[PDB]
Amino acid sequence: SMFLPPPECPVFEPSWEEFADPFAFIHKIRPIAEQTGICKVRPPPDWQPPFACDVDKLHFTPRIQRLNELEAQTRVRDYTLRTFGEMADAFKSDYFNMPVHMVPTELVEKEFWRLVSTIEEDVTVEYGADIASKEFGSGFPVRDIKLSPEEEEYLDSGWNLNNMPVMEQSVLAHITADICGMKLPWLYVGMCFSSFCWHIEDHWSYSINYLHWGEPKTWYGVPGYAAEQLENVMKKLAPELFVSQPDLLHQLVTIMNPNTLMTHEVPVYRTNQCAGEFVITFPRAYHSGFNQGFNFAEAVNFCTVDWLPLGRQCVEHYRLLHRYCVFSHDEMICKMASKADVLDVVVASTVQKDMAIMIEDEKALRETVRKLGVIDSERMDFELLPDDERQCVKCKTTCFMSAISCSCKPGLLVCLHHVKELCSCPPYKYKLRYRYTLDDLYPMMNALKLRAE
Ligand SMILES: Oc1ccc(O)c2c1[C@@H]1CC[C@H]2C1
Ligand SMILES: [Cl-]
Ligand SMILES: [Mn+2]
Ligand SMILES: [Zn+2]
Ligand SMILES: [Zn+2]
């Protein structure tokens, strides 16, 4: 009746021993947590990073949000942290005519789903979302200011979210392409009912979220295996979200009742994340939620060796949908192979397996365009080109291994799947532009094999 809360997602309480290495722990819980999409992690009781900030000197620009189910919103005036906190507390307090910490969490959840479904409520809220900067920085300790002995303790923690991208069990790391939205932590200031719509991470990566302080955050999550099942339910009830988006900054997303999904046999899980807890989302796991009140959270994307195959399948899927990429997956693979001597040995072994698939697909593709009559060729350093200067005119994929050009249409490229879409000239006028010959590639893969012994 009205709202039936989904079943709870798994909650983990690792010992200090298990907690020490984040990457080993995530790998251990993976068979459980990948069945539910999200999961929650309670750190050992004495792991408590200091949070310190001046509420008057931190300022940020707020986003405004309307709260209607199935209405399109796009992914990605001034407040100090204090003035925002005052606005947010007054708002919740007046909405319920109660002291903000006496409003039960079950009630806010029930009320959230009522107000987004009711056509005649026009409730709007405000929130903060931004990567770290000079005006507003990480809530975790970072180097700069003289630090206290306890701040120093957490500087090199694996669960300090600043460190997590640049550790060596992670495969974004040795990458230099500066895909900034994905190596840097985002900061989120919440108030009651402020919401994050249904979505998955760029390139189907993991994410990890830490709530520093304040009232809880409520999550809904769907396992990766049910991603297409959820998208079919979404297309049927709100097709406007699926019209082709011009850019990467034009992704359309929405609020949708998890009960609607469960009615159509999509598995949904929930949790309340409290201050000092982590939530982790797994590859291709849809998630959404809202805040119970005034709070402060920090989040980061990351990629493990487990993810490498999915990362390839994802870029393939982007091509079918003509979606833009954040980075080139093959460029990342080749960059790791060129640094094979300093890679973790398990990393090296997993990269090698992906590289073997890459090379075999590339061989087949070059044979196919040769038989279409493209004969001329020249080496080309794709990584020097700005990304928007090396997308396939048809499918918008970011080229790195190879592309086709023509003197007729200067500066345009197509990937090798779309040779017929460049122009109307005969194929002998075309040129195959390539980063590596097959003979360059096999020694790069052999270096990985040696490093992996
Ligand atoms: O196996 C699960 C797991 C979670 C969940 O919320 C649901 C199911 C069935 C499918 C939707 C409802 C019933
Ligand atoms: Cl509404
Ligand atoms: Mn997310
Ligand atoms: Zn293409
Ligand atoms: Zn031409």
Side-chain angles (χ1 to χ4, degrees), residues 235-244 246-266:
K235 287 167 208 186
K236 213 178 185 175
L237 308 183
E240 318 77 53
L241 307 182
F242 294 84
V243 306
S244 282
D247 317 345
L248 249 173
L249 304 181
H250 286 64
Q251 340 185 70
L252 289 190
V253 290
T254 209
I255 296 167
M256 184 192 279
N257 197 311
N259 280 170
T260 304
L261 293 167
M262 300 157 72
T263 279
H264 288 84
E265 299 169 84
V266 179

Side-chain angles (χ1 to χ4, degrees), residues 199 201 207 281 287:
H199 77 282
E201 303 311 316
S207 68
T281 64
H287 51 281

Side-chain angles (χ1 to χ4, degrees), residues 37-111:
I38 57 177
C39 77
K40 186 163 70 179
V41 177
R42 272 202 259 272
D46 49 335
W47 194 90
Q48 327 222 344
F51 189 85
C53 66
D54 186 281
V55 288
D56 300 290
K57 288 176 185 176
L58 299 162
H59 63 286
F60 69 94
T61 288
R63 289 112 198 265
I64 310 197
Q65 182 168 65
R66 305 164 65 222
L67 297 176
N68 311 117
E69 197 173 358
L70 299 184
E71 186 177 68
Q73 303 183 40
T74 71
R75 241 173 85 192
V76 325
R77 222 289 170 180
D78 200 76
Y79 281 106
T80 64
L81 209 53
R82 187 193 297 271
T83 53
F84 183 92
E86 280 162 357
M87 173 279 290
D89 281 351
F91 174 93
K92 181 173 181 181
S93 187
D94 291 350
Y95 195 94
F96 290 99
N97 191 40
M98 267 188 291
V100 277
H101 308 66
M102 299 202 42
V103 194
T105 56
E106 295 75 20
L107 179 68
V108 183
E109 179 176 52
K110 259 167 44 82
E111 174 58 6

Side-chain angles (χ1 to χ4, degrees), residues 339-359:
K339 293 276 183 293
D341 58 330
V342 300
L343 288 181
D344 183 274
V345 297
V346 188
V347 170
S349 179
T350 308
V351 177
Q352 172 208 250
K353 300 193 223 303
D354 200 51
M355 195 161 184
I357 283 149
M358 188 188 67
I359 292 174

